[PDB]
């Protein structure tokens, strides 16, 4: 029994062991209460403005679109404190945890950004934060691991399974199954059991709210389409939410195509996976034919969640949003293009969204279109990866 619907059509739900249901119901009730509580809202707004740096800029990219009839803006979540959009919702969830009287935070992370975000929010707000991270990811994300530690968080490598993000997701849930009376699980994307897909969208929807006000200010109308990469689905649903009822606005989600869909080495479960039940929800999953969960593959380490938020699978099924994929090489070309032509180094995650907008432009250069790409993060962190690849080439 819940206050809010845990499903988006057939997708979502609360598939957790019975012992965790009270934790979920408590969190849902606290969230509903907080959303009507003007003091909570003012406190969240204050941190987002004076700590995180909201609102973020909406930047027009005329050098990129020159000679075409595309006008492109980038929503600058790369300028948010922490360098990625994840900061919005961890501040919100930290406040929820405090509203419930909890003093401890558990979080999982793959590429490290969610760990950094949850560690910063925890440091600012007086919470004791412990982070689970697959040991293969610890090894390849030494910088982020040290940032988490400088920020006081405990980082716990996970050696089970494939020792990457899904295994850290499992470990966070195991720990919470025993510590929910004192700890809040600060889940890192718009996925997992209700109420997380709903909370994470609502604590990211300022991205699209600001984008709408900003584009009306600058262009006097809504975008023809808003475009965002989809790892687990939070930055994209944050951009899309406020436009869902604006039926003229296309919502395009971009999953990692990796080495190419036909190779099987990709991270696009929404369009190329198979619905399953795992991590507390029913949703499309990367999985073997027998039902074992598998990893997502991308040149971008943060598009690693091997499933996708249930609201995206629902918006896709009713045809309100469209989902496509972009390969490693397309994402790399977009990363290079933005650096050279706009002086902005984008996260390789976000470069997947930009790459799809560039194809929309270049495929049909005389189509008049106003596009916004959610630039979910900055790409300082990707400089070595990009360097070494281009070195393998020249």
């Amino acid at each position: 029994t819940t206050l809010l619907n845990p499903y988006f059509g057939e997708f979502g739900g609360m598939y957790v062991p019975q012992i965790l249901m009270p934790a979920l119901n408590q969190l849902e009730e606290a969230f509903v209460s907080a959303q009507k509580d003007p003091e909570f809202q003012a406190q969240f707004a204050d941190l987002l403005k004076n700590y995180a740096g909201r609102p973020t800029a909406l930047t027009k990219c005329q050098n990129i679109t020159a000679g075409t009839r595309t006008t492109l803006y980038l929503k600058r979540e790369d300028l948010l404190h922490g360098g990625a959009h994840k900061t919005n919702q961890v501040l919100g969830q930290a406040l929820l945890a405090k509203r419930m009287g909890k003093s401890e935070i558990i979080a999982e992370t793959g590429a490290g950004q969610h760990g950094v975000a949850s560690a910063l929010a925890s440091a600012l707000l007086g919470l004791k934060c412990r982070i689970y991270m697959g040991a293969k990811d610890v090894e390849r994300q030494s910088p982020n691991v040290f940032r988490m530690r400088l920020m006081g968080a405990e980082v716990i490598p996970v050696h089970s399974g494939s020792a990457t993000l899904k295994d850290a997701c499992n470990e966070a849930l195991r720990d919470w199954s025993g510590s929910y009376e004192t700890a809040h699980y600060m889940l890192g994307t718009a996925a997992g059991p209700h109420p997380y897909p709903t909370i994470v969208r609502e604590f990211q929807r300022m991205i699209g709210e600001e984008t709408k006000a900003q584009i009306l200010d600058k262009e006097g109308r809504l975008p023809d389409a808003v475009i965002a990469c989809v790892g687990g689905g939070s930055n994209a649903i944050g951009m899309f939410a406020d436009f869902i009822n604006d039926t003229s606005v296309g919502l395009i989600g971009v999953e990692p195509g990796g080495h190419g869909i036909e190779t099987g080495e990709h991270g696009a479960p929404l369009k190329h996976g198979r619905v399953g039940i795992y991590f507390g929800m029913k949703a499309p999953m990367m999985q073997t034919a027998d039902g074992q969960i598998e990893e997502s593959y991308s040149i971008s380490a943060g598009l690693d969640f091997p499933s996708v938020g249930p609201q995206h699978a629902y918006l896709n099924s009713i045809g309100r949003a469209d989902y496509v994929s972009i390969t490693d090489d397309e994402a790399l070309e977009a990363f290079k293009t933005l650096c050279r032509h706009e002086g902005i180094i984008p996260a390789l995650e976000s470069s997947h969204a930009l790459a799809h907008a560039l194809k929309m432009m270049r495929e049909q250069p005389e189509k008049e279109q106003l596009l916004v790409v959610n630039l979910s993060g900055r790409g300082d962190k990707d400089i070595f990866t990009v360097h070494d690849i281009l070195k393998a080439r020249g």
Partner: protein
């Protein structure tokens, strides 16, 4: 069939509790696992709880995490587990056999198809670890259409509404959880369970088997004294496997000794 009902009736006629070991099918390989299972039965197991190896067992502690890893190291698949189950049933016609599953493996290729396969091989119950009662409907319905008892976990603080639902929805036995957290042998349960047990009887729930942290004979006799119909031990059994990988013979002997002592604690 009526295997659990027959069992519990028999044990009640002897004023005896059930002792039910758990192992992961195929740990540490298929042939050894079949030998382990026959040894558990010969040593006195009243029923079996059997895990199908899954990639992401998010309700299990390290011991059973590792059982799953060993089984995957041997290439064990769900289809191979179903072949094992068929052979175990062919050898042992009355002992009740319950599976411990994660949802994806049941939903994977159709929930109704999974329960129909369970019925075909002669499985008696299925506990899906990550399906709470709130999400259980298609699972319990398919179970019951195929003569499989759907088993539910009753947490030690379960409220009344939850007790009533667990009573109404489960069949075969009620899994009475000793404590929060995940499977593990080391952490013993600090909760008086007499109340949940009485309330379960009041609501005509399936007989309770206590599980989580059940690692010694005295806990078996205590569960029975508190009014439970028996107890399940898994991590403790799996640790015997883990400790004896290099000597299959000693592994079977230590399993035999442990099961024998646990089952002896359940007798009037």
């Amino acid at each position: 069939m009526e295997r659990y009902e027959n069992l519990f009736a028999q044990l009640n006629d002897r004023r005896e509790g059930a002792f039910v070991p758990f192992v992961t099918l195929g740990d540490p390989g298929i042939e050894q696992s079949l030998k382990i299972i026959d040894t558990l039965i010969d040593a006195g197991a009243d029923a079996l709880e059997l895990g199908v190896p899954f990639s992401d067992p998010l309700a299990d502690g390290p011991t059973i995490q590792n059982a799953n890893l060993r089984a995957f190291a041997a290439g064990v698949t769900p289809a191979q587990c179903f072949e094992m189950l068929a052979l175990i049933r062919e050898k042992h016609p009355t002992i009740p056999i319950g599976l411990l599953m994660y949802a994806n493996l049941v939903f994977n290729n159709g929930i109704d198809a999974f329960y129909a396969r369970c019925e075909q091989v002669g499985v008696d119950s299925v506990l899906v670890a990550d399906v709470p009662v709130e999400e259980s409907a298609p699972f319990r319905q398919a179970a019951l259409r195929h003569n499989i008892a759907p088993i539910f976990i009753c947490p030690p603080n379960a409220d009344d509404d939850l007790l009533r639902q667990v009573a109404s929805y489960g069949r075969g036995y009620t899994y009475l959880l000793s404590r929060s957290g995940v499977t593990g042998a080391e952490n013993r349960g600090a909760l008086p369970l007499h109340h949940l047990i009485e309330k379960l009887k009041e609501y005509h729930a399936a007989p309770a088997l206590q599980g989580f942290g059940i690692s010694s004979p005295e806990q078996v006799s205590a569960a029975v004294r508190a009014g439970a119909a028996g107890a399940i031990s898994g991590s403790a059994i799996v640790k015997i496997i883990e400790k004896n990988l290099a000597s299959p013979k000693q592994m079977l002997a230590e399993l035999r000794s442990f099961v024998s002592a646990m089952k002896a604690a359940s007798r009037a």
